[PDB]
Structure formats: structure tokens, C-alpha cells
Structure 1
Amino acid sequence: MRNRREVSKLLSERVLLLDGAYGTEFMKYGYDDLPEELNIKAPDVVLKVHRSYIESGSDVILTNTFGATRMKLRKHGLEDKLDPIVRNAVRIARRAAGEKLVFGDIGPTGELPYPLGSTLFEEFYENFRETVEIMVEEGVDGIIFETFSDILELKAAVLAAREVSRDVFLIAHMTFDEKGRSLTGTDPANFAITFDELDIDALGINCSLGPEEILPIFQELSQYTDKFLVVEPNAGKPIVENGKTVYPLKPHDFAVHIDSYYELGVNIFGGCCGTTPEHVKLFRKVLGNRKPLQRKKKRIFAVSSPSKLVTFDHFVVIGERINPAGRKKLWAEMQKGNEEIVIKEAKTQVEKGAEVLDVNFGIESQIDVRYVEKIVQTLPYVSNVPLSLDIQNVDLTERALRAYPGRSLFNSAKVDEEELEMKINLLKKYGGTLIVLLMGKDVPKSFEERKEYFEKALKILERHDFSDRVIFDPGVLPLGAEGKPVEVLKTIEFISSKGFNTTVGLSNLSFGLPDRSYYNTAFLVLGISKGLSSAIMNPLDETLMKTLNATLVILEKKE
């Protein structure tokens, strides 16, 4: 009913109050049934609880639909009841909220993405799409994806929601353990950096921990995003009593933490486990009417995997090995869909020092798309590191980007208006950074020409507001093509001096002459001395890796 523009307006004016736990309230009323089923079996109980929260002061209540998606309901033999479940939930909540806001509550499926589980991006996507269609049709004032523990599943959810409606206010939440990590390894900074650039309106943290525990985790989150913030802590740390887990933190003890979150810029405050109407009533009194606080986010250049965030504030080794070009064995296996061989190449490269992995599938026409999707989802989880997606076809590109678990690096976009704009828009929609190759219709032979390509690229990036999401690749040419490597060094220095990260397809310098390892080493050392911030290289080359480390030690970049 109310759109994201309208909700954003309200948020800019005042911090809002959410509601509390529903499950335990239903239980206090003698109903232990699956919450979602109550929307059909005992709608009066659902309404009663919504009203208890509204009367407590809640500015917004959540629909009783946390587990209402086909994938989750299937586990209870209720998949065929998805429609009446969600429609009734929205109607019941609307009836209770009256004028107040009603957000559609959508939790995770409980299924982990392949390779941890057996689910691919597309299925999660369709799964979330269906529930959002119902809520939008029934008139929710926003959607909040609650308690997500994995970024790929969360990414699929928001992309699905946004595809159904560009106007619905979207809120994405992740839950963290006491060590500040999601089930699959994501920390606050990673979550903020990966999701801040997606088309959602707010980010948040809910459940798992109490008020004090979430505080530092919330602070880290607030530093990397300028989106609206939400927090719903559990009512303290769990304690087991009569053989059951309870969250004893009383209203006053919970409510006193409100100021701390407010000082950190929170825009919506609510409570999770153990939160009762009694707790909300006090939250209302304590919160009152306040205008949110301004924040100003930290801006950094980084790419990510579910468990690792790689910031370009140090030389980044990008493993070049998962590339069938000139690799007879690998090429044949990729064609037959061999995942294990690629998994092994990834693992060994990281074990040797690669922090990011370039992934290319040779002649894309000869590769199965499902294979590509399985590999893109798989590597970040099993190898633990982010990927540089080395893909040519725009078609495959979009499929890889939407299924990528984190914020990736996209390999090369030549200096061509059409190609750049096209790849920029895909990255804007799905997230990610871009390697811009300094060439277009032909290869530059000088530093002068490379500079022209750089200047033309900056112009294009500038008008598409994408200058802060790029890494420049000057374009190393083979020494067997009079590739004048010195012109490449000048270019690296010039670009570095302007504040931009850089990289090179290292091996291309010696792919036409023996003792390539030594040419590769010499160039890398020289490149680093000119500001080179990374390189697509062979981490299995002991000579190159050891000399690389020595260089960094000598230039005082590490020990």
C-alpha cells in the first residue's frame, strides 16, 4: 500500500518501533502448532497477538509468515497451503494494524545452497518470488527478510523481491553468532559491503544474540552502509530452566540499551526471542519520538566470498589456473562437467597464497551452463576465497553474477562504450567490481595510447557513477610481439598515482618464449615497485611467489 519512497520519508523523520516474538505468545495462549498454520487453523490467535503489539505502541508489525515459502512448508506437508497461509496472514495483520505499517516477514528456507546443500540460486529465487507476489498483492508496506544465515540465499531473496516490485521497501537481515559470523562465515562488514550496493532499502541484524552482544556487531554494520538500519536483539542471553530455553532479560534491562543503538544510527528497533508485549510497551515509552542520527559510511574497495573479505590495501594474488586455455586435461574435464578437478585447482592455489581466483570456462559455447553455475556457487564455499569471473558472453555473465555468493570481481571490460555500459549495468544490478582492460578496437603500442584509453574509460565510468568500483589492467603484451613492457610499467605508475588499483594478466608477457617464470618474476617485481596492486598470476610458481614475498618484505609491505 505504501511504497518505499513513502517509508523512507517516514524513517528519515523518526525512528520506528517494531513488534515482538509471536511463537512464544501463541504458546502462552495454548497453541504450539506451527505458527504459519495458525493463520488458517486459529486466525483469532494470530490477530490477538498482533493487536497486543499494536496496543503496546508498535509502528510496524510483521506478518506471521516467517516459514511461509514452498521450500520450508514442504517440510510440513503444507506446500499446497502457501496461498491461503500468506494471504490470511497479511489480511489478519492489516486488520490489526489499521493505519500502522505491516511488513511481510520472510525467513530462510532452512536449505543451504549447493555445494553445502543441493539448492541452486534459481530455485531459491523462484521460491522467494512466489511469497513476495502474494504479499505485494495483499498490500504490505514493506518486506523484511528475517534471520538469514547465508548470503547467497539472502541475495536470491532480495533479487526475487525486487523483481516482483521495484516500489516495495526492502529490508535484509542476517543473524550472527557470538563471534560475529553467520552460519556460512559472513561478518558484519562483509554483509554490509556485499548488500549495500544491491537495490534494497535497509540492512539489519536480528536474533541469535542479546542487546549487549549485538552492539559491536551492529556498529561494524553501520560503518559500511548508508542504508537504513534495523536491529532486533533477543531478550538477553539464553538460559535453560525447566528443560527449556528461555530469554529472561526483563523490559527495563532490555529497553535501556535503546540509546546505544540510537547513537549508532538505528532506524527501526524491535526485539526477537523472549520479546513480549510488556517489553514493547516499555520500548515505546523509552524510544519516544526521535529523529534518526546521520552516519556517513566508510568507503573501501573489496571483493568477497561468504567467509572472506579481500580488501585491496595490500598486494592481492589472483590465481590464474582455473583456465582451460592451453590446458588439454582441464579443458576436457570441464566439457564433461568435472567439478572435483576444478575444486582441487582452487584449493591448491589458495593453499599456495592466492587470495582470489580467476575462473574462466574457455570456449563458453562448449560448456554446460548448469556446470558454470555449480562451479560459481561452489568455489567460494569450498576454497573459501572470492572469485574473479573471467567470462566473455553477456548471457553467461548475467547467470554467473546472480548466482555468485558475495561481491565478485568481473574480469575485463574493454574500453568500449557498449561493452562497458552493458557490463556496468549488470554489476549495478547484481553487485561486484570490474577490471577495465586498457584497449578496445585494437591493442595500444605505447604509454601514450594506454593513457588515452584510461582517460576515455574514466569519462565513461564517471557518467555512470562507477569510478569507485574498478581496477585497471594496462594490458601486458607478449615479448614476442614487441609488447614494450616498459610502456606498461609507465602506465601502472600513472594510474597508481591517480589513486586507482591495478592488475595484469602476468603470464601473457612470456606466453611465447621459454624461462617464462623468470620474465614473469622480473615484471611482477618491477610492476609492484611502480604501484601494481595485484596480478592474475600462477601461485604454483614457487620462484615467483617467493620473490613476490621478498619484494613485499623489502618494500616494507609485510614481513
Structure 2
Amino acid sequence: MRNRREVSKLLSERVLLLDGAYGTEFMKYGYDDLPEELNIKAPDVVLKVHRSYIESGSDVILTNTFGATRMKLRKHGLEDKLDPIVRNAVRIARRAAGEKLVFGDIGPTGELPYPLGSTLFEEFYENFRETVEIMVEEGVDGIIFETFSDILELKAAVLAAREVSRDVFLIAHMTFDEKGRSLTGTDPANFAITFDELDIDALGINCSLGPEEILPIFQELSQYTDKFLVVEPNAGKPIVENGKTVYPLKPHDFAVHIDSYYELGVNIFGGCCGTTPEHVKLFRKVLGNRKPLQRKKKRIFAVSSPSKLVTFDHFVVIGERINPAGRKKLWAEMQKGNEEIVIKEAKTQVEKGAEVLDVNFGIESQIDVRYVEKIVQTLPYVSNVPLSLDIQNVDLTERALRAYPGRSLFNSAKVDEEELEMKINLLKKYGGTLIVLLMGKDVPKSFEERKEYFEKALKILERHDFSDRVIFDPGVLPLGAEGKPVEVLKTIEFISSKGFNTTVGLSNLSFGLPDRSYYNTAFLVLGISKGLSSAIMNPLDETLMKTLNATLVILEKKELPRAEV
């Protein structure tokens, strides 16, 4: 009953105020039932608390639906009460809301994504789709995913929501500990980078930390995103007055941070665990009828994993081993569905220095589609490093981009009008970066030719505003096929001059000749000197790795291992 343009037009005009805890407010009225159940067993309390806040000055209240999802309600055997639980909630809230805003509040299922758990991107996606549909029907003024602790789950949630409506105002939230990490690893910047390019309207933090510890965390985020920001700290560092649970921070020692958050560009302020209508009554005062600030997001090219954020601000070793396309061995297994052999090759390369893993599925037509989706999701957790998805088929590309936990590096996309625009789209929808391989109908042979391809891809890239999301691959040829590698170098330089990142299929140079390791090492050094910022290579080639490291030290792009005597 209110689109996202409206809701933004408002947020741009003035900083909004949210509400505090509800569970603890139900506790005060003797109700200890699952808060989401009081929508059926005692709508009065629910209506009361919503009022306690709207009076304290809240401009937006969250529907009493945090645990309102199939997967969660199921743990408390309520899978069947889901429909009315939510509908009442929106209605109960809509009541106290009055003229204010009502946001559907959706919390995390509380299940870990496989392997840390046993849930696949699909189960999550479908889980959140169901509820987000109930709410959108009921006319919520937006939807907010609070306290999420895993980019994969939160990714499913946002995609599901957005699949339901392209007009409802969306808000994604993650919760970090004091170390600045999520449950599975995402730090503020990762989260920020990974989720900014998704069709959500705002990002934010809530719970786990008081207004104090949350301040810097909120800043890291505010720096890597231009979307609206929301924050809802706890009520100070948790303690136990009777061994139970008590939040110290008073309405004054709390409401005094509003200033600090205001300057970091916040748009919506509220409170989590320990916050009461009292606090909000002050927030209303300390805050006032202000107007939001600006900050300009610091641009940065990086891919991510649930736990690691790789920035192309140094040489990025892209592991090449997981490639059944070229290994008749690994392909035989992976086709059979072996997940172990793949998780192993993954772990090995990371140990040796690979910061990103390139994964390809060999003969795409004969590979179990559900296996791809399971591996695509799995690796990032058992390897800790991002993945360079080496798919070719458009259909596999999508089934894979969806399930990938984070911001991926998508391998391949020739400079073909169609393929490009088709790949750009998939990425704009699921997020990610693109490896544009300088070659069209057929392979270019000269530095001149490659430049025409580059020049062309640029036109297409700008045309779709996606030039800030690409790494260029000049295309390497085997020496024993008249490669003329000096032409690829002239290209690496040319692109690196224009301001782009570059990678090469290093092992392409020597296929078909002995002492492959030498030509590779040689080429890499030469390549790096010309600008090459990354290279799908074999981290297991020790000499290549060492010579590489040496090269970087020499070039002042990394530093000393400790001089002796």
C-alpha cells in the first residue's frame, strides 16, 4: 500500500525513527509465548506495543513477524499458522500505525547454509518467498530483513522478496559481533560491496552490539554503499542483574549517539534488544526533524566469499586446477557427482596461495545440474575464497549465479553484442563482475586486432553502464600455434593504461611444449611488469609462485620476507 519511490522520497527529505524491542515488551505484560503467536492468541498486546512506540514518536514500526517463516515456525510446530500469523500482524500493526509506515519484519530461518548446515539456496529462497508474498498482499510499506548472519541466506531472502515485487521498498540487515564479522565471516565492507549491487533500497546493522561498538562498523558500511542506511543498536553491553538478561544503557546514554550516526549519513534510526518506548521517546527528542547527509561511496573492485573479500589492489592468484573440462580424471568423478575430489583440489590451491578459485564443470550438457548448484554454494565455505565461475551455457550461468554466496567473478563473455548484453543482465540481477575475453567471431592474432575488440566491448559496456564491473582477458595463445605472446603483452599494457584490471589463461602459452613451467614463469613476470593484475594459474607450480612473489617484491608491490646476516 505504498511503493519504494514514495518511501525514498520521504527518507531523502528527513531522517526517520523506528521502534525498539517487542519481545521484552510482551514479557512485561506477562506474555511469554513466541511473540509471533500473540498475533493469534492475544492481538491486544501486539496492538498495545505498536502503540507504545508510535506514541513515543516512531515514524515506522515493524510487523510482529520476525519468526514468521515456514522454516522457523516449523521448529515450534506452527507451519500451518503462518498465513494468519502474518496477515493479522500486518493488520494489527496497520491499526496502530495510523498514518505512519509499516514494514514487514523477516528474520533468518536460523538454519546454516550447507555445508555448515543442510539448507540449499533453494529452500531459503522458497522459504522467504512465501512470507514476502503474504505481506505484499497485505500492503506493507516495505520489507526489512533483520539480524541476518549469512550472505547466502540474506541473498536468497532479498532475491525472493524482489521476485515478488519490484516496487516494495527493500531493506537488508546483517548483524556483526565485536570483531566486525558476521556469523559466517562477512565483514561490513564485504556485506556492503556484495549487497549494494542488488535491487535492495537500503542497507543496515542491528543487534549484537550497543550504539558504541556498532559505530565504526556502521561506518565501514556507510563507506561502501550509496543506498539508504539503517541502524538499530542494542541497549549497551549486555549483563546479568539476576543472572537472567539486562541491558544497562539508559535512554540518555543511548540517545546521545544519534549525532554520531547522523553525520555518518544514516536515514533510519531505531533500537534492538533492550530498547523500550522510553528510549524511542528520547530518540524522538535528540533526533528531531532533520535531513539526511551524503558521503559518496569509495569505489573498489572486489569479489567475495562468505568469509573473504578479495580486492584487486594487488596481484590476485586465480587457481586453475578445478577444471574437469581439461582433466579427463576429475571430469569422470564430477560427472559421477563426487564432491570430495573437488573440495580437495579447492583446499589445496588455497593453501598454496590461490586467492580465488576458477571452477568449471567440464561437459556442461552431461553434468547433474543440482550438483553444480550444490558445489557452487559449497566451495566458498570449505575454501574460504571466492570463485571465478567458469560456465559457458547461459542456463547454467543463472542457476549458478543465484546460489553463489557473495560477489563472483564470472569467467568469459566474448565481445559479442548478444552474449555480452545477455551476461551483463544475469550479473546485474544476481550481482558480480565480468571477465571480458577480447575476441569475437574468431580469435584475434595481433595487438591491433585485440584493441579493436577491447574498444568495441567498451562501447557495449558503457551502453549498459557496467564498465566498472569488468576485468579484461586479452586472450593468450600457445607458442606452438604461432601465438606471438609479445602481442598479448602489448595488450596487457594498453588495457592497464586505460585503467582496467586484467587476467590471462597463463597455462595457454605452453600447451604443447616441454618445461611449460619456465615459459609460464617467464610470461607471468613479463606480464606483471606490463600491468597484468591477475592470472588464472597453477598455485601448485612452486617455482611459478616463488618467482611471482619475488617479482612483486622487486616491483615494490609487496614486501620483504626478512633479511639475514
TM-score (norm 1): 0.99
SS at match of 2:456: helix
Q: Deviations over 1:21-54 (max 9, x none)?
A: 0000000000000000100001001000000001
Contact 1:412 1:436 in 2 (8 A): yes
State the alpha-carbon separation in 2 of the partners of residues 248 and 273 from structure 1.
Answer: 11
For residues 43 and 489 of structure 2, what CA distance do their matches in structure 1 show? 70
CA positional deviation for 1:124: 0.5
Q: Tell me the CA shift for residue 285 of structure 1.
A: 1.1
Deviations 1:233-291 (A, max 9, x none): 00000001212111121101110010000010000000001100111101101111001
C-alpha separation in 2, matches of 1:390 and 1:341: 18
Q: Does structure 1 residue 261 correspond to structure 2 residue 271?
A: no
* CA–CA distance in structure 2, aligned partners of residues 324 and 101 of structure 1: 53
Question: Does the 8 Å contact 2:90/2:104 carry over to 1?
Answer: yes
Mapped pair 1:313 → 2:322? no
Displacement over 3 Å in runs of 4+: none
Rounded to whole Å, the distance in 2 between the matches of 1:188 and 1:32 is 34
Structure 1 residue 440 displacement after superposition: 1.0
SS of equivalent to 2:231: strand
CA offsets, 1:286-340, max 9 Å, x none? 1110010111110000000011000001010000000013322211110111111
Contact 1:3–1:168 (Cα < 8 Å) also in 2: yes
Report how far residue 554 of structure 1 moved.
1.1
Deviation string, structure 1 residues 446-474 (Cα, Å, up to 9, x no partner): 00000000000000001100010000000
Task: Please give the secondary structure, in 2, of the residue aligned with 1:235.
Answer: coil
d(CA) in 1 for partners of 2:266, 2:247: 23
Distance 1:35 1:326 in 2: 55
Structure 2: distance between partners of 1:492 and 1:358: 20
The Cα offsets for residues 344-402 of structure 1, whole Å up to 9 and x where unpaired, read as 10000000000000000000111111110111111111110000000001001001101
CA contact (8 A) 2:436 2:472 kept: yes
Contact (CA 8 Å) 2:57, 2:281: kept in 1 or not? Answer: yes
What is the match of residue 436 of structure 2?
A: 436
Q: Which whole-Å CA distance do the structure 1 matches of 2:285 and 2:552 have between them? A: 57
**Deviations 1:143-173, CA, capped at 9 Å, x for gaps:** 0000000000000000000010000000000
Q: String of CA shifts for 1:111-155, please: whole Å, max 9, x gaps.
A: 011111111111100100000000000010000000000000000
Deviation of residue 513 (structure 1)?
1.3
Indicate if the aligned counterparts of 1:388 and 1:410 stay in contact, CA closer than 8 A: yes
**Which of 410-419 and 326-335 deviates more?**
326-335
How many angstroms apart in 2 are the aligned matches of 1:442 and 1:480? 18
Shift of residue 428, structure 1, vs aligned partner: 0.3
- 1:445 is displaced (CA, Å) by 0.9
Asked if structure 1 preserves the Cα contact closer than 8 Å seen for 2:39 and 2:46, the reply is: yes
Partner of 1:199: 199
Q: How far apart, in 2, do the equivalents of 1:365 and 1:116 lie?
A: 29
Name 1:508's counterpart in structure 2.
Answer: 508
2:12 and 2:259 mapped to 1: Cα distance? 17
CA shift, 1:553, in A, is 1.1
C-alpha distance in structure 1 between counterparts of 2:372 and 2:27, whole Å: 46
Partner Cα separation in structure 2 for residue 279 and residue 504 of structure 1: 56
Unpaired runs of 5+ residues, structure 2, are 559-565
Q: Is the 8 A contact 1:50 1:93 kept in 2?
A: yes
CA contact (8 A) 1:233 1:270 kept: yes
**Helix, strand or coil for the counterpart of 1:480?**
coil
Instruction: Determine helix, strand or coil for the equivalent of 2:436.
Output: strand
RMSD: 0.6
| Alpha-carbon distance in structure 2 between the residues aligned to 1:450 and 1:92 | 63
Equivalent in the alignment of 1:536: 536
**Alignment check: 8 A CA contact 2:326 2:362 kept:** no
Aligned residue for 2:245? Answer: 245
SS in structure 2 opposite 1:209?
A: coil
For 1:65-464, list aligned pairs within 5 A: 65-464=65-464
1:31 aligns with 2:31: yes
Residues 316, 534 of structure 1: 8 Å contact kept: yes
Q: Separation in 2 of the partners of 1:535 and 1:544?
A: 12
**Deviation at residue 556 of structure 1 after TM alignment:** 1.1
Q: Shift in Å at residue 481 of structure 1? A: 1.0
Check the 8 A contact 2:144/2:170 in 1, yes or no: yes
Does the Cα contact within 8 Å between 1:57 and 1:281 map onto a contact in 2? yes
C-alpha distance in 2, partners of 1:514/1:394?
36
Matched, 1:40 2:40: yes
Aligned length: 558
Contact 1:115 1:374 in 2 (8 A): no
SS at match of 2:467: coil
Equivalent position of 1:64 in the other structure: 64
Q: Distance in 1 between matches of 2:469 and 2:477?
A: 25
Secondary structure at the aligned position of 2:413 is classed as coil
Q: Deviations over 1:409-441 (max 9, x none)?
A: 000100001000000000000000000000010
Q: Which moved more, 1:513-522 or 1:145-154?
A: 513-522
Please say which of residues 524-533 and 510-519 is displaced more in the overlay. 510-519
Shift of 1:512: 1.3
- Contact 2:150-2:186 within 8 A present in 1 as well: yes
Give the 5 Å matches for 1:479-498.
Answer: 479-498=479-498
Q: How far is the alpha carbon of 1:514 from its aligned partner?
A: 1.4
CA distance in 2, matches of 1:325, 1:228: 44
Q: CA deviation at 1:480?
A: 1.4
- Deviation of 1:543 after TM superposition, in Å, equals 1.2
Q: Secondary structure at the match of 2:173?
A: strand
- Please give the alpha-carbon distance, in whole angstroms, between the structure 2 residues aligned to 1:288 and 1:325: 61
For residues 499-556 of structure 1, give each alpha carbon's deviation from its aligned partner in whole angstroms, at most 9, with x where no partner exists: 1000000101111111111111111110001000000000001111111111111111
Whether the 8 Å contact between 2:151 and 2:406 is mirrored in structure 1 is: yes
CA distance in 2, matches of 1:543, 1:245: 57
> Post-superposition shift, 1:206?
0.1
> Aligned-pair distance for 1:195?
0.4
Separation in structure 2 between the aligned mates of residue 478 and residue 192 of structure 1, nearest angstrom: 40
For 1:20 and 1:529, locate their aligned partners in 2 and report how far apart those are by CA, in whole Å: 56
Aligned counterparts of 2:402 and 2:324: Cα–Cα separation in 1: 23
Deviations 1:64-98 (A, max 9, x none): 00000000000000001100000000000000001
* Worse-matched range after superposition: 509-518 or 203-212: 509-518
Q: Which residue of 2 is the match for residue 545 of structure 1?
A: 545
Rounded to whole Å, the distance in 2 between the matches of 1:220 and 1:235 is 21
Verify the 8 A CA contact 1:410 1:432 in the aligned structure 2. yes
Distance in 1, matches of 2:34 and 2:382, equals 35
Distance 1:520 1:325 in 2: 20
- Alignment partners' CA distance in 2, 1:227 and 1:501: 26
Identity %: 100
User: How many angstroms apart in 2 are the aligned matches of 1:45 and 1:445?
Assistant: 74
CA distance in structure 2 between the partners assigned to 1:98 and 1:171 by the alignment:
22
Is residue 149–residue 182 contact of structure 1 (8 Å, CA) maintained in 2?
yes
Tell me the distance in 1 between the aligned counterparts of 2:256 and 2:545: 53
Q: Write the distance in 1 (CA, Å) between the matches of 2:537 and 2:420.
A: 24
Specify the SS of the correspondent of 1:55: helix
CA displacement, residues 167-206 of structure 1 (integer Å, 9 cap, x when unaligned): 0000000000000000000000000000000000000000
Aligned partners of 1:400 and 1:422: how far apart in 2?
A: 15
